[PDB]
């Protein structure tokens, strides 16, 4: 007997991940060929990401794009579970510059299309792919670029930033290395920028055998801009590889840039005074404005837990309506010497309730604000 | 049905609500001069009114509003008008309305167009407030210059009925007897008072002729707020209107024998709430509004 | 349909030759195929207990890490049940995934990300548009308090929070 799961008999080991491989399989009757992902689930139970899983094949399954790898079944068993997904013959895109070297700027732009075309799709639909790589890009025998590995994905959500550190340091933002918080699709187009250059140069703009040197490089954005490269490419990769968030380029001003609106097909891209301040400022020590809201948060009778020491969730009982509104409290750092408290509402599941979500949050952050100023 | 009251049954308000949108709201203890400040400030024409005790949206503040407290404290220009400085929009709200016995009058993102413009007819209003029934939030405030617009680029498209090519003489739309109107000289209380007693949107601007030769609307009664010039109503309406008068390109005024599409093509372009009916002498023979056009596209 | 349902025998460790012998197959001796060090065959079992040995180099044994059964003849046999919740996928994700609000009295501040620093009603818009009219905001800012210092007495709050595909921004007077 072979090894066989859904008509499917299992092959070769194409790659590995954190948890189970990938192998090939071949239909017995057709001979089709697909990539199965085998999942252990007494493995992702040891490390508690079964949210992650579960939440990752629930987006990842209703995605349908010609240059995001697809997902056809996924098979439980007792021991495993089986990722069945669409099989791309032409390996990895890293492999691919290994041998062949840097790409004519012609063919750079068709795959950085492609690919771009992909991570649009993604964040779109509120998914942050954030391992992007040549490694993590595949390609079919016709050399179309195909994004793989969702593992290190995740799912962004209104109001949430994403604290986690995830990829290799030569693709990972300056934001990223230095742990700091991000919103994530502008994680993703560092990246991609990354990657552009790489098609073109064949090289990576931020490497080095150091890592303190290699840390200090991306944080810094200097990277080598070779002889051979159009000054109007190097625009965009001067745009994408910022190191200010606020100040990199988004999909919308890549799909403006001349570079990249040239030769660009029809189907990649689906037709398309008083001064305001963020929550409340104190330059008073950390643990004694958190020491302050927690006073004045019982003065209320509000109920609160500790989530973290700069983070609480507060919940209040509205005398009148009789339900409940929950806001969040976190504290940032805007300077030095500067602290903020930042103020955050959160969405009830509740039946229809009486009065308005949006006002009885106000009003909720108005008692707490009226005592802190 | 009409080929528009199908259009009008078929889509809901949220086609309506626009991708990103300000929404101002007052709470009733607020002072009621403030209020008004902030209207000219946001640059937004109503708000809605929250009670912070009963925790619900009780009404609308407007420029209706501004002008039914300044007719009614208003003394001299040499004293100020304390109500207006010492009131709260609840204080206000008790007096103004301590017979009146009003509600809020509210409509779901859901409810289609055809139970917005019928509940704007049925209670006489302007603002209608768009309320989700789910989180109990004001979503959008409801016009009827945003729905005649809307369904203008859809007209378009569709067969024309008979409808839209008959004059207004033999349509009959509009009001053609008993307008409200004001000289030239007439003082801007005086204009306060045709506003609160014929409760009309605008006041066309006539010479001893009768002429129209310019037009006095409650949006301008704003002006005042945003000048704080509105301690002093013993000016003129048309010293009033000076203040618009860099850019005036002159009144907005249609004929009897005009075709009905004509006029729609003509408000909708104008961004103005009604048209001044004269004969051709410049006469004023009446007005059409958009609640007008609004109420003979409703109906069959 | 119900009544064939895959089922993974895994044997970890080395061999010349591996077999799997079983309930299900009669007690035959069937194949394994190895990749480096595991040993698997893929079955499809009815629902039910099924007992189940290895055959391991000439060696008849069992798998210590798997439950067992003891019977009253001395056999050490593995066993296994198939159940439902093991072959639908969110319902074995479900099973595999296995809060005191009260107030008490009680490492730096994450640095204020620049995401927050857009305020939308900071931003000025076209004087040919309608001013109730914004720009579409960042998913990001959506929920998060803004405010205006205080002045006359009077405190204004707002905020940003998302109706479908709309967004509506919401500001607040109230008095202190
Ligand atoms: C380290 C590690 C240990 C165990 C693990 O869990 C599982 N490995 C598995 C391998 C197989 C499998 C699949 C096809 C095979 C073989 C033989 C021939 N062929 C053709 C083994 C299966 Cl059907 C289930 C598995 N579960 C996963 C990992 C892991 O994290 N990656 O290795
Ligand atoms: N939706 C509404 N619910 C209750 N009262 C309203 C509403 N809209 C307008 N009003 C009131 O009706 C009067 C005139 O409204 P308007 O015609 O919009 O100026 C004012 O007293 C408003 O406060
Ligand atoms: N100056 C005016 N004199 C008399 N009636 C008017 C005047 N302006 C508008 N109307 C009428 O008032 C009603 C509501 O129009 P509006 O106040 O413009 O929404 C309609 O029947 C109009 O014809
Ligand atoms: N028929 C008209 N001709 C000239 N100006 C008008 C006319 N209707 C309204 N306006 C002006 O348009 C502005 C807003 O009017 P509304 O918002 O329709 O009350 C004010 O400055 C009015 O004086």
Redesign the interface.
């Given at each position: 007997?072979?090894?066989?799961?859904?008509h499917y008999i299992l092959g070769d080991?194409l790659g590995v991940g954190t948890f189970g491989k990938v192998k090939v399989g071949k239909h017995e009757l057709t001979g089709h060929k697909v990539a199965v992902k085998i999942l252990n689930?007494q493995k992702?139970?040891s490390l508690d990401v079964?949210?992650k899983?579960?939440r990752e094949?629930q987006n990842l399954k209703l995605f349908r794009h010609p240059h995001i790898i697809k997902l056809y079944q996924?098979?439980?068993?007792?021991?495993?579970?089986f990722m069945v997904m669409e099989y791309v013959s032409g390996g990895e895109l890293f492999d691919y510059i290994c041998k062949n070297g840097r790409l004519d700027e012609k063919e750079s732009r068709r795959l950085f299309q492609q690919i771009l075309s992909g991570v649009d799709y993604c964040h779109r639909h509120?998914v942050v792919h954030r391992d992007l790589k040549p490694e993590n890009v595949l390609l079919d025998a016709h050399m179309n670029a195909k994004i793989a590995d969702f593992g290190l994905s995740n799912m962004?959500?209104?109001?949430?930033?994403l604290?986690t550190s995830c990829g290799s340091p030569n693709y990972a933002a300056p934001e990223v290395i230095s742990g700091?918080?991000?919103?994530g699709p502008e994680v993703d187009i560092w990246s991609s920028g990354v990657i552009l250059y790489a098609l073109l140069c064949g090289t990576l703009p931020f490497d080095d055998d150091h890592v303190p040197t290699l840390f200090k490089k991306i944080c810094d954005g200097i990277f080598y801009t070779p002889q051979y490269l159009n000054p109007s490419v190097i625009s965009l990769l001067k745009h994408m590889l910022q190191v200010?968030?606020?100040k990199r380029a988004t999909i919308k001003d890549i799909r403006e840039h001349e570079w990249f609106k040239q030769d660009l097909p029809k189907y990649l891209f689906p037709e398309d005074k008083?001064?305001?301040?963020?929550?409340?400022r104190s330059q008073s020590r950390?643990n004694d404005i958190?020491?302050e809201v927690?006073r004045a948060?019982?003065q209320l009778d509000?109920?609160?837990?500790?989530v973290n020491?700069?983070y609480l969730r507060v919940?209040r009982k509205?005398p009148?309506?009789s339900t409940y509104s929950k806001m969040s409290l976190?504290?940032?750092?805007?300077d030095s010497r500067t602290?903020?408290l930042?103020?955050?509402?959160?969405?009830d599941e509740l039946t229809?309730?009486?009065?308005?979500?949006?006002?009885?949050?106000?009003?909720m952050?108005?008692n707490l604000?009226?005592i802190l100023? | 049905n009409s080929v528009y009251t199908s259009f009008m049954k078929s889509h809901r308000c949220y086609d309506l609500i626009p991708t990103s949108s300000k929404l101002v709201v007052f709470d009733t203890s607020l002072q009621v001069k403030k209020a008004f400040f902030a209207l000219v400030t946001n640059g937004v024409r109503a708000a809605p009114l929250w009670d912070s005790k009963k925790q619900s949206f009780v009404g609308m503040l407007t420029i209706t509003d501004f002008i039914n407290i300044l007719h009614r404290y208003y003394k001299s220009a040499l004293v100020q008008i304390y109500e207006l400085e010492e009131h709260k929009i609840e204080t206000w709200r008790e007096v103004y309305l301590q017979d009146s016995f009003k509600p809020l009058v509210c409509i779901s993102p859901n409810a289609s167009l055809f139970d917005a413009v019928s509940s704007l007819i049925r209670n006489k209003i302007h603002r209608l407030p768009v309320i989700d029934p789910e989180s109990g939030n004001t979503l959008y405030i409801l016009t009827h210059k945003r729905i005649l617009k809307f369904l203008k680029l859809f007209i378009t498209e569709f067969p024309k009925p008979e409808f839209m090519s008959k004059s207004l003489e033999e349509l009959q739309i509009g009001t053609y007897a008993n307008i409200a109107m004001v000289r030239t000289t007439t003082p801007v209380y005086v204009a306060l008072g045709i506003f609160v007693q014929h409760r009309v949107s605008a006041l066309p601007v006539v010479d001893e002729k009768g002429r129209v030769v310019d037009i006095y609307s409650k949006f301008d009664v704003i002006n005042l707020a945003a000048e704080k010039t509105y301690n002093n109503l013993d000016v003129s309406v048309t010293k009033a209107l000076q203040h618009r008068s860099h850019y005036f390109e002159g009144v907005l005024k249609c004929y009897l024998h005009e075709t009905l599409e004509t006029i729609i093509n003509r408000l909708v372009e104008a961004e103005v709430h009604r048209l001044v009916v004269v004969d051709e002498n410049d006469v004023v023979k009446g007005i059409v509004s958009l609640s007008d056009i609004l109420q003979a596209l409703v109906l069959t | 349909p119900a009544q064939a349902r895959p089922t993974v025998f895994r044997w970890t460790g080395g061999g010349k030759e591996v077999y799997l012998s079983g309930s299900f197959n009669n007690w035959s001796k069937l194949p394994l195929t190895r990749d480096h060090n595991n040993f698997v065959a893929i079955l499809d079992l009815p629902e039910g207990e099924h007992q189940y040995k290895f055959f391991v180099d000439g060696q008849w044994t069992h798998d210590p890490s798997e439950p067992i059964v003891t019977s009253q003849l001395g056999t050490v046999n593995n066993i296994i049940q198939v159940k439902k919740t093991d072959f639908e996928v969110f319902d074995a994700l479900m099973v595999d995934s296995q809060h005191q609000e009260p107030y008490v009295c009680k490492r730096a501040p994450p640095i204020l990300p620049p995401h927050l620093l857009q305020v939308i009603l900071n931003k000025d818009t076209g004087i040919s548009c309608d001013p109730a009219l914004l720009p579409e905001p960042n998913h990001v800012m959506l929920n998060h308090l803004y405010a205006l210092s205080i002045k006359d007495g009077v405190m204004v709050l707002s905020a940003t929070h998302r109706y479908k595909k709309k967004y509506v921004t919401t500001l607040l007077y109230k008095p202190i």
């Amino acid at each position: 007997g072979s090894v066989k799961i859904g008509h499917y008999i299992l092959g070769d080991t194409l790659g590995v991940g954190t948890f189970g491989k990938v192998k090939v399989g071949k239909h017995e009757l057709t001979g089709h060929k697909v990539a199965v992902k085998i999942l252990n689930r007494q493995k992702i139970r040891s490390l508690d990401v079964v949210g992650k899983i579960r939440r990752e094949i629930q987006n990842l399954k209703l995605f349908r794009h010609p240059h995001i790898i697809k997902l056809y079944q996924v098979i439980s068993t007792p021991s495993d579970i089986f990722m069945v997904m669409e099989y791309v013959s032409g390996g990895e895109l890293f492999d691919y510059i290994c041998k062949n070297g840097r790409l004519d700027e012609k063919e750079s732009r068709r795959l950085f299309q492609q690919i771009l075309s992909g991570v649009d799709y993604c964040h779109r639909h509120m998914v942050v792919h954030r391992d992007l790589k040549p490694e993590n890009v595949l390609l079919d025998a016709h050399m179309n670029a195909k994004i793989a590995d969702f593992g290190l994905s995740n799912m962004m959500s209104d109001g949430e930033f994403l604290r986690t550190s995830c990829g290799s340091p030569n693709y990972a933002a300056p934001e990223v290395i230095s742990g700091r918080l991000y919103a994530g699709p502008e994680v993703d187009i560092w990246s991609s920028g990354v990657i552009l250059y790489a098609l073109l140069c064949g090289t990576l703009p931020f490497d080095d055998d150091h890592v303190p040197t290699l840390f200090k490089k991306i944080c810094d954005g200097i990277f080598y801009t070779p002889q051979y490269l159009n000054p109007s490419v190097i625009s965009l990769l001067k745009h994408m590889l910022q190191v200010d968030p606020m100040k990199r380029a988004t999909i919308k001003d890549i799909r403006e840039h001349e570079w990249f609106k040239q030769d660009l097909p029809k189907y990649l891209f689906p037709e398309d005074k008083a001064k305001w301040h963020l929550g409340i400022r104190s330059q008073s020590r950390p643990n004694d404005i958190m020491a302050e809201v927690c006073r004045a948060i019982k003065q209320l009778d509000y109920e609160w837990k500790v989530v973290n020491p700069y983070y609480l969730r507060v919940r209040r009982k509205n005398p009148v309506t009789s339900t409940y509104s929950k806001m969040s409290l976190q504290l940032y750092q805007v300077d030095s010497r500067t602290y903020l408290l930042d103020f955050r509402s959160i969405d009830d599941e509740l039946t229809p309730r009486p009065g308005s979500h949006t006002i009885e949050f106000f009003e909720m952050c108005a008692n707490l604000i009226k005592i802190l100023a | 049905n009409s080929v528009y009251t199908s259009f009008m049954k078929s889509h809901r308000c949220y086609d309506l609500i626009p991708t990103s949108s300000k929404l101002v709201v007052f709470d009733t203890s607020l002072q009621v001069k403030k209020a008004f400040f902030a209207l000219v400030t946001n640059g937004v024409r109503a708000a809605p009114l929250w009670d912070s005790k009963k925790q619900s949206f009780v009404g609308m503040l407007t420029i209706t509003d501004f002008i039914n407290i300044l007719h009614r404290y208003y003394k001299s220009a040499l004293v100020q008008i304390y109500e207006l400085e010492e009131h709260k929009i609840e204080t206000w709200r008790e007096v103004y309305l301590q017979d009146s016995f009003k509600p809020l009058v509210c409509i779901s993102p859901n409810a289609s167009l055809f139970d917005a413009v019928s509940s704007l007819i049925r209670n006489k209003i302007h603002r209608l407030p768009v309320i989700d029934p789910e989180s109990g939030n004001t979503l959008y405030i409801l016009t009827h210059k945003r729905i005649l617009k809307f369904l203008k680029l859809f007209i378009t498209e569709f067969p024309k009925p008979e409808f839209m090519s008959k004059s207004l003489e033999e349509l009959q739309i509009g009001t053609y007897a008993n307008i409200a109107m004001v000289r030239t000289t007439t003082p801007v209380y005086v204009a306060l008072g045709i506003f609160v007693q014929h409760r009309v949107s605008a006041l066309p601007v006539v010479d001893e002729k009768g002429r129209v030769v310019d037009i006095y609307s409650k949006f301008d009664v704003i002006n005042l707020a945003a000048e704080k010039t509105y301690n002093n109503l013993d000016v003129s309406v048309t010293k009033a209107l000076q203040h618009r008068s860099h850019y005036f390109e002159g009144v907005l005024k249609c004929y009897l024998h005009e075709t009905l599409e004509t006029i729609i093509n003509r408000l909708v372009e104008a961004e103005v709430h009604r048209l001044v009916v004269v004969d051709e002498n410049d006469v004023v023979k009446g007005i059409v509004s958009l609640s007008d056009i609004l109420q003979a596209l409703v109906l069959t | 349909p119900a009544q064939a349902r895959p089922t993974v025998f895994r044997w970890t460790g080395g061999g010349k030759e591996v077999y799997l012998s079983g309930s299900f197959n009669n007690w035959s001796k069937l194949p394994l195929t190895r990749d480096h060090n595991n040993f698997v065959a893929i079955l499809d079992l009815p629902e039910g207990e099924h007992q189940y040995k290895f055959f391991v180099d000439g060696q008849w044994t069992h798998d210590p890490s798997e439950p067992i059964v003891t019977s009253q003849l001395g056999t050490v046999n593995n066993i296994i049940q198939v159940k439902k919740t093991d072959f639908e996928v969110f319902d074995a994700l479900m099973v595999d995934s296995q809060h005191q609000e009260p107030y008490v009295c009680k490492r730096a501040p994450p640095i204020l990300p620049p995401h927050l620093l857009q305020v939308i009603l900071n931003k000025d818009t076209g004087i040919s548009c309608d001013p109730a009219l914004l720009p579409e905001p960042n998913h990001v800012m959506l929920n998060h308090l803004y405010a205006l210092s205080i002045k006359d007495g009077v405190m204004v709050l707002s905020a940003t929070h998302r109706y479908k595909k709309k967004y509506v921004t919401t500001l607040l007077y109230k008095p202190i």
